[PDB]
């Protein structure tokens, strides 16, 4: 079951304050659904970088009083870990038709 997933070790996907260029280097050549979380160049915000159709996509993570997320009304998650675990089994497509992938493969899994 899902308890076995590498996502439960946050260090398999959270690469700290790595920038966009470093994320592109870490994800270059990786299979679709490989992802990481990192700080954004927008200070105080996080980003997901994920491979979709062989290309890296970068998504901002919002933080509201109800939690982290990608867009209202889904800013629900109390931590990055809860967000990642949710989107390991929920496609990002609900947010944008070009993001039909899950957060499937932590970069350091």
């Amino acid at each position: 079951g899902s308890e076995d997933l590498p996502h439960h070790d946050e260090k398999t996907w959270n690469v700290g304050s790595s920038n966009r260029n470093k994320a592109e280097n870490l994800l270059r050549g990786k299979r679709d659904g490989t992802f990481l979380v990192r700080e954004s160049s927008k200070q105080g915000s996080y980003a997901v970088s994920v491979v979709v159709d062989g290309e890296v996509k970068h998504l901002v993570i919002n933080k509201t009083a109800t939690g982290y997320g990608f867009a209202e009304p889904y800013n629900l998650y109390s931590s990055l870990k809860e967000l990642v675990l949710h989107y390991q089994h929920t496609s990002l497509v609900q947010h944008n038709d070009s993001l039909n992938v899950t957060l499937a493969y932590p970069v350091y899994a």
């Binding site: 966009r20 970068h58 998504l59 009304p73 070009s98 993001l99």
Partner: peptide, 8 residues
């Protein structure tokens, strides 16, 4: 940089 837009 450019981020993918995620409308509410």
């Amino acid at each position: 940089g450019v981020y993918v837009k995620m409308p509410p």
